[PDB]
Structure formats: structure tokens, C-alpha cells
Amino acid sequence: AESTLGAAAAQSGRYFGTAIASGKLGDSAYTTIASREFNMVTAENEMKIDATEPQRGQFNFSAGDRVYNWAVQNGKQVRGHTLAWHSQQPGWMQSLSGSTLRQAMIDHINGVMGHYKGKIAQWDVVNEAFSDDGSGGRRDSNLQRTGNDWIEVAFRTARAADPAAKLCYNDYNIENWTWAKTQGVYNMVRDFKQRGVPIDCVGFQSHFNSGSPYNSNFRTTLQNFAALGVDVAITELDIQGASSSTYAAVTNDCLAVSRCLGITVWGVRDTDSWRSGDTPLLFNGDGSKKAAYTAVLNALNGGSSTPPPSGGGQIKGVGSGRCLDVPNASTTDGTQVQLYDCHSATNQQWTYTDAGELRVYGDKCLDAAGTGNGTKVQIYSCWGGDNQKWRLNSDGSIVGVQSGLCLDAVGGGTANGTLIQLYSCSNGSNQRWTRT
Amino acid sequence: AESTLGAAAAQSGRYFGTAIASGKLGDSAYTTIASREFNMVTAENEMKIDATEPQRGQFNFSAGDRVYNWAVQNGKQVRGHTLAWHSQQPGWMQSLSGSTLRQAMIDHINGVMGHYKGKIAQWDVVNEAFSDDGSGGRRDSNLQRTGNDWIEVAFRTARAADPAAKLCYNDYNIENWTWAKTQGVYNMVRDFKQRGVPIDCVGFQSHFNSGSPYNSNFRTTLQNFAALGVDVAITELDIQGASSSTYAAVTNDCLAVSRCLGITVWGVRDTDSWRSGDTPLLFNGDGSKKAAYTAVLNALNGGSSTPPPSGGGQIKGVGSGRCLDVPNASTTDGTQVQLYDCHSATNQQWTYTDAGELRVYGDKCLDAAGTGNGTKVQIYSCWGGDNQKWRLNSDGSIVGVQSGLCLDAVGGGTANGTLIQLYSCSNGSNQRWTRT
Ligand SMILES: O[C@@H]1[C@@H](O)[C@H](O[C@@H]2CO[C@@H](O)[C@H](O)[C@H]2O)OC[C@H]1O
Ligand SMILES: O[C@@H]1[C@@H](O)[C@H](O[C@@H]2CO[C@@H](O)[C@H](O)[C@H]2O)OC[C@H]1O
Ligand SMILES: O[C@@H]1[C@@H](O)[C@H](O[C@@H]2CO[C@@H](O)[C@H](O)[C@H]2O)OC[C@H]1O
Ligand SMILES: O[C@@H]1[C@@H](O)[C@H](O[C@@H]2CO[C@@H](O)[C@H](O)[C@H]2O)OC[C@H]1O
Ligand SMILES: O[C@@H]1[C@@H](O)[C@H](O[C@@H]2CO[C@@H](O)[C@H](O)[C@H]2O)OC[C@H]1O
Ligand SMILES: O[C@@H]1[C@@H](O)[C@H](O)OC[C@H]1O
Ligand SMILES: O[C@@H]1[C@@H](O)[C@H](O)OC[C@H]1O
Ligand SMILES: O[C@@H]1[C@@H](O)[C@H](O)OC[C@H]1O
Ligand SMILES: O[C@@H]1[C@@H](O)[C@H](O)OC[C@H]1O
């Protein structure tokens, strides 16, 4: 299996999940994508403190079970999120402190895990317990104020409530190894494992953006925590701008770590994202697969037999043996591309960008004017439109994000001058290409 | 004078307008921009057929007058749009055909022009009467079916109704001289002039996109029509992607033809556009100027006597002599840029794209991780965010679209290694940059 993210991940014993919003389970466009692509589910909000215990001692597992049931019935495991957190607590808990609060925490953990006992693969017992000031220490919350040992207490309680569930510590900004926050969490987990504190995994939310960008050392971070004897999981992945290279990089980081259980992206479509403005997911609002989607799938499936091109290269048709060429090195918008004998020349040098464009001359983009069969493929000023974004299938076909159609050599032409158009993908040789 | 589009355009004896939507005049941010930048107004829908004559014989100018009143109150002239058209006809007119339709057409023209008699600078008497099948013939509508002479009849009627108004024939896809449609309208206009049919102008909608891309021959198209003895006007300008170069090219084409009266963009902010999806206007949804706005303004002001860096190039600050440099030529996202001795290296080669980005390495973008003062300017994967878009002002300053702040060398730094940040513009030497 390797046509969907979930199946591709399963090949290596891993999973590819998402965050499910109970309210969207009635939207077939939403559920059609979610049920097909993912084999792990996290309730976006339905299993949080305020949602499961609106009143102390008064547990409401309605919305939560709705998500749990849908997940299991559709062949997905579940990550419980989350049991002890300073954020999203019921109004009553936000007022508690010291001994009373500590007690409420314990009770809550027992209540939720009791109800779900033996059904949850991973539980984010404690979430975001460290600050971002740079000190590398605990953030000041009513929870921390109950004593520095709360985290440890939460995990012991957790193990007790349900020993079959993997207990994780979940946080954000602990992906970059050089960051103090990261080191603070690292030391704690090292401490816990040495003292025998029950903790089985560390969740790296992985919310990357210009404020806190992804860094290649992320893999080093995972390997380090892995060496401590705890599993690692990418829990809430979303990348501002959904760069193909970054998504693929995070994917390979997990595949490179034997203890990395899997990857979960925080949402289905960009429009479902808590940060839609950053279009940080793998699917467009119209449900179409984004450039990064294919980048992730290809990574999960084992990459290419030959190391991919590094900016600026040729694209020759398999059936013709000729290259994607812009007639007479023209640079005027609207010029339809053709096939031509391969040779070193700017008008045959295409660069695949992280945004999914196929650039030429530096600021011109492979462009599709329309979404139907026969649409001419031309060059046009780059502007980021979905009709200028393409997915590089591992089978050699290049699919337009917006149209869902393949680059096609008209009438299966192989001669110089054959024009390129969009057409239903057919696996024909006039729809397959190799990049250098 | 030269700070706003209207005032700049006025320095060449031309106007710069927009399309106003009555339902948006209650939006303060919209009116603030609209009132400041344009001196010519077109009702986006309020003066159309269905809006001005709901039932046959019953005129209604409430919606049209709201726009008109606002236009005059803010010192703008008005273009009446539109009197005879196959589209947006009220249902009672859609039902008409033959001589009944012909007289209805005439009756509509007299009623609307009568109401606005002496108040309209230009009237789009007839709109989109030519086919779009690429043959250059008449569009098949109930109007055309009343007889080939309907257009002529509309103009003669219009002249008599308000002799003070300039009578225009408006249409789209008539910008590229090679298109059959463009030639068909030319032939018609030429025929009207030779036979004495009253027509004073031809409006070129200029709705450019990858399906109907702007072409440099547009200038000849304008010249050709101008030669027939009529004025020309870019009436509904918007460019898919809003390329800075294309917006500048169109502007220069109009300024190159003495008979080109002015330029009207079809909307204020991209969010106000009938095609927001193509982010085709000059202003963002938050009201900030796009890189294309600056390009248009600079062109209106005559541009620079020194050609911009055609692909690649360095950026050197005046009060620093140093060139924008990426530390150790790194390629890691989040790397704050600095100033340094201008050497021949790629980590100093910045390309200003038509989308407004400052790219280095081919696919890395000058990025702003915030909007406030002090925000560190770094490089990040290009994805199109406004925090990656920049405007190159004529005063040598580079201001961030999203932030509205200027690139600034920390504490007036000038020595190698000075970090770059975002700070309120100040004409300070540590905020002016030169490029060659
Ligand atoms: O609620 C939390 C956010 O406040 C948090 O914000 C992060 C702060 O550090 C910045 O560098 C990040 O870019 C920004 O996302 O993110 C996690 C969320 O749970
Ligand atoms: O719908 C929103 C959720 O998507 C959001 O989820 C949180 C995002 O930041 C992460 O650090 C947290 O772990 C995660 O739960 O919470 C707010 C809710 O309104
Ligand atoms: O170049 C285009 C061909 O690639 C295209 O091929 C069709 C693909 O779908 C199959 O079911 C058809 O049998 C096959 O001909 O045909 C159109 C042509 O322009
Ligand atoms: O209603 C009109 C549209 O039908 C028209 O559509 C254009 C047709 O030619 C294509 O090449 C263009 O891309 C497409 O926009 O555009 C103008 C609009 O008023
Ligand atoms: O709000 C929309 C208007 O912006 C739109 O305006 C028309 C666009 O196509 C041009 O060819 C026409 O001349 C112009 O009036 O009309 C539809 C309306 O919903
Ligand atoms: O320690 C971290 C520091 O290295 C980074 O630059 O900014 C965030 C801090 O938490
Ligand atoms: O684009 C083609 C060019 O690359 C080749 O060299 O000569 C023929 C052109 O059509
Ligand atoms: O980035 C700088 C590099 O471009 C220069 O050559 O040497 C000093 C570095 O800091
Ligand atoms: O360089 C900055 C200067 O331009 C501004 O005026 O004041 C703050 C400084 O950091």
C-alpha cells in the first residue's frame, strides 16, 4: 500500500495522522479525505480538560467519544489530547491552586483515562510545561505553582489509570536542539528515565514558521530523546507555507529514527487549520492535494532511486526523449511550452520550488490556463496561483495542483515542436518525465 | 502631487480611478483608500441595466446615486457603466426580442442618461458586443438579434440624450492586436467614424490573466484606435497575480498614447475584487499597498532614468556602503541577514520578483518574523506571505508590505556584521539602499 499517506507510513511500521474536529465529521468532503489518508486520529479539542470535565466531578465524554468512535470505525488509532495543561482548563479549574488544584488534576487524569482505558495508543499527559523566555525552565502556571513535581505526579497517576497507553510529554518549540526550552525538556526526560518516572514518549508538536523555523537539527533532537529510551512522535505538524522540502525533511527525520512512531499533521485542509492564513497543511480548501502532499507521500514510500535535482534542471519526456522547452527562449507570458531536443540552455532549465512551481528564467512559471483537458501549458509571471503549482509523482508524471491533470505531450507526439497540454493522467509515456 | 495614484496620473493630464461598490462605502478602511488614491469613479454594478430599470418603464437610481454622491463629495469624476449590454439585464428585458427589445434598449438609454445628464464624464454606451469565440464577429444576444445596427442606434440615442458625455464602446479581450476580437471592434469603430456615428472613446477593460495575458503589442492597439480619432481608456484593469512589471507596462502604454485618458482598476482591495482569487488589484485585504502599487506609482511619476537590476544583483545601503549579506552564505531558515563588504558572492545576490519578493539562493526569501519595530529580518523558504513581500520606494527605502516598516541597519550600524531589522521608515541613511 502506498497511494495514501496512512498506507505509505504503515510500510515502515509508522502512522500518518491528523487532528479531527468533531463538528466537521458531517461534511463528506472533509470525511472523504480524512478517512482515506490517515490511520491515526487526535481529537482537536474534544478530549481537552474543559471539554471533558466542564464541572469538577461532572465528566462529559460525548464529543470525545464521537471522535474516538469515528476513528476506530474507520481503521484509525487514537492519541488522547490532553490531560494536564495550563491552557483550555474549565473556568473552575483556572481558579484552583495548590493542594486543591493538584487534587483536581489527579482526579481529572483518572476520570478521562478511566473512561478511555485500553483504547488510547498515546496520551499527551502533560502539555507545554516549559516557558519560551529562554531560561529553559518551567512556565509559570497555576499547575506549576502547585509544586515542581506536578509533571512527575501526573505521569505516575497516568500509568496507574491505564498502563496499556503510552504516556507522552507534549510541547512546542522543543524541535531545535540548540534551544534552551528543548534542553530543559531533554534534561527532565533524562531525569525521569533515570529515576524511573513512568514516561514512554515525547511529543514534538512541530509547529514551524518564520518565528520558529524547522531546522535540520530536528533529527538530532529526535535521536537524542530516542537514545534516552523514550519513543518520539510528531504530534501537531503544520508548516507555514507548506514548503515541499520542509514537509519532506520532517518526514525523513521521522523515518530516520527507529523510535519515531509516526507523524500527525494538525488538520485536514488548509481551511480547517487553526492557522489557515499560513496555509500550513497538505490539502487545499477545495480538497485538492498540495505540492507538499506528494512530497510527503514520496518520502514515506522510500524516495527516488536516484537523488533528485538541486534547482535548475531539464525535464525530458520518457516517450519522446525530448526536453520541456520554451520556444525560442521567449519570455513573453502566454508562450505555450513544447518538446525539443535536449541541450544546455536557460529555456530548458526548470527549477522546482518549495511552493511547487516549475520556474524558468528565474521569474517565469509553468502555467496552466484553465482546468480542462487540452488546456495549454505555458509560461507566465510567477505569482503563486494553484494553476502554477505542480506535484512530482514518483511514477514520473507531473500533476497540476489546481486541475489534477497531468502534463501531456499532445497526441502522444514525440517530434520537436510537440506542444504540451493538460490531460487526464493516463500513465502513458507522453505523460511521464525524468528530471536531471 | 506624486504621492497618490490620482495626483501622479494628473501630472500627465490623466486620471486614475477605481470601481466603487455602494455596500462597501460604510467600510472606513475602504473609503479611506478609495478617497485618497483615485480621482475617477465607476459604479461596479449600481448603474447597470437591472439596477436602474427593475421593471420596464420604472427607473431606480438610488443605488447609482449613492456611488455618484460619494464620488462628487470626494472630488472624483464619474464613468457611467453601462447602458446596453447582453449581461445583467433585468428579467423583463431578457424576455424581450425584436423591435420590442430595440425600443426598450432606446428607452433605457434615455431614462438613465436623462437622470445623469451633464454629470457623467464618460458613458460605456455599449458593452461587450463582440463574440469571444475568437472570430471577431458579433456576440449572439437578444440585442444583436434585433439587427446589426443596434450598436449604432445606441450611440446615436446616447449622443442626443447627453451631448456633454463622451460616448465609449467597452469590451474585454480587445487588448491584444493579434486577436480577431480586437480587429472586429477596430473595424466597427472605423466604420462609425467614416459614417458619422457618434462615438468618442473605446474602453479596454484590460482584465489580464494567463488565459488572456497582457502583451506589449497593447501599445500599438491603443495607438491604432487613437488614430481613428477617438480617445482610449483602460477601464477595468486587474492583473492575475498583480505582476509589478505588467502593471508598470500597462501604465507606460497608456502614458505613451496621448489619447489615453486614464486608467481605472476594477476595485480597491483584493478582497473587494470580483476575482479576489487572482489577487489582481493594488491593495491587500488589510489595506496595505502591494509591490505593484509602487510599480504603478513610479511609472506614473515617469520611473527612474536608471534601469533596475535585470535579474540578480546586490543591495547596498547608502549610509553604510555595505551590501545586504546572509551570514556565512548560510541557507538555514531563520538566519538574520546583515551588512558586509560587497563581494561577488551569491549570498549577496538578491532578485526582486514581480510578486514583490527579494530572493536569494533562488528559492529563499527575505522574511520578516513579525511586524513591530526591531523585528529581525531573515531569510525563509519562499511561500508568498506578505511578510516576504517588499516595496522599493523612490526614496531608496525598502518597506515591508505586511509590516509597513522599512529595512533598517540596527542602531545606525554601518560596519560589517550589523544586523538588519524592521523599523519605522525615516529617510535615514540606514534605511536607503542602492542597487546596480
Ligand atoms: O498557544 C501556543 C502559541 O502561543 C505558540 O506560539 C509560538 C510562540 O513561539 C513562536 O516562535 C512560534 O512561532 C509561535 O507559534 O505556539 C504553540 C501554541 O500552542
Ligand atoms: O481549535 C484550536 C486547536 O487547534 C488548538 O490546538 C492547540 C494548538 O497549539 C498546540 O500547542 C496545542 O497542543 C493544541 O492543542 O487549540 C485551540 C483550539 O481553539
Ligand atoms: O495527448 C493526448 C493523449 O495523451 C490522450 O490519451 C488518452 C488518455 O486516456 C485514454 O483513455 C485514451 O485512450 C488516450 O487516447 O488522448 C488525447 C491526446 O491529446
Ligand atoms: O464575463 C467576462 C468573462 O466571460 C471573460 O472571460 C475571459 C474569456 O477569455 C479568456 O481568455 C479570459 O481568461 C477570460 O477571463 O472575462 C471578462 C468577463 O467580463
Ligand atoms: O461584482 C461583479 C462586477 O464586478 C462585474 O463587473 C463586470 C466584470 O466583467 C466586465 O466585463 C464587465 O464590464 C463588468 O461590469 O459584474 C458582475 C458583478 O457580480
Ligand atoms: O534559547 C533560544 C535561542 O537560542 C533562540 O535564538 O531564541 C529562542 C530561545 O529560547
Ligand atoms: O526552443 C527551441 C530551441 O531550444 C532550439 O535550440 O531551437 C528551436 C527552438 O524552438
Ligand atoms: O557572510 C559573510 C560573508 O559573505 C563574507 O564573505 O565573510 C564574512 C561573512 O560574515
Ligand atoms: O537603527 C534604528 C534607527 O534607524 C531608529 O531611528 O532608531 C532605532 C535604531 O535601532
mmCIF file of C-alpha atoms and ligand atoms in Angstrom, chain B residues 408-412 421 423 430-431, ligand 9:
data_model
loop_
_atom_site.group_PDB
_atom_site.id
_atom_site.type_symbol
_atom_site.label_atom_id
_atom_site.label_comp_id
_atom_site.label_asym_id
_atom_site.label_seq_id
_atom_site.Cartn_x
_atom_site.Cartn_y
_atom_site.Cartn_z
ATOM 1 C CA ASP B 408 16.902 49.145 8.901
ATOM 2 C CA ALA B 409 20.513 48.676 9.994
ATOM 3 C CA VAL B 410 20.379 48.302 13.781
ATOM 4 C CA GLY B 411 21.393 51.416 15.703
ATOM 5 C CA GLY B 412 22.587 53.149 12.555
ATOM 6 C CA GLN B 421 15.670 44.688 11.280
ATOM 7 C CA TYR B 423 11.846 49.914 11.935
ATOM 8 C CA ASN B 430 20.465 53.352 7.417
ATOM 9 C CA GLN B 431 17.223 52.758 5.503
HETATM 10 O O1 LIG C 9 18.651 51.865 13.668
HETATM 11 C C1 LIG C 9 17.447 52.320 14.265
HETATM 12 C C2 LIG C 9 17.203 53.778 13.896
HETATM 13 O O2 LIG C 9 17.093 53.908 12.485
HETATM 14 C C3 LIG C 9 15.906 54.249 14.562
HETATM 15 O O3 LIG C 9 15.682 55.588 14.272
HETATM 16 O O4 LIG C 9 16.012 54.110 15.996
HETATM 17 C C4 LIG C 9 16.244 52.730 16.398
HETATM 18 C C5 LIG C 9 17.550 52.222 15.775
HETATM 19 O O5 LIG C 9 17.775 50.872 16.156
#
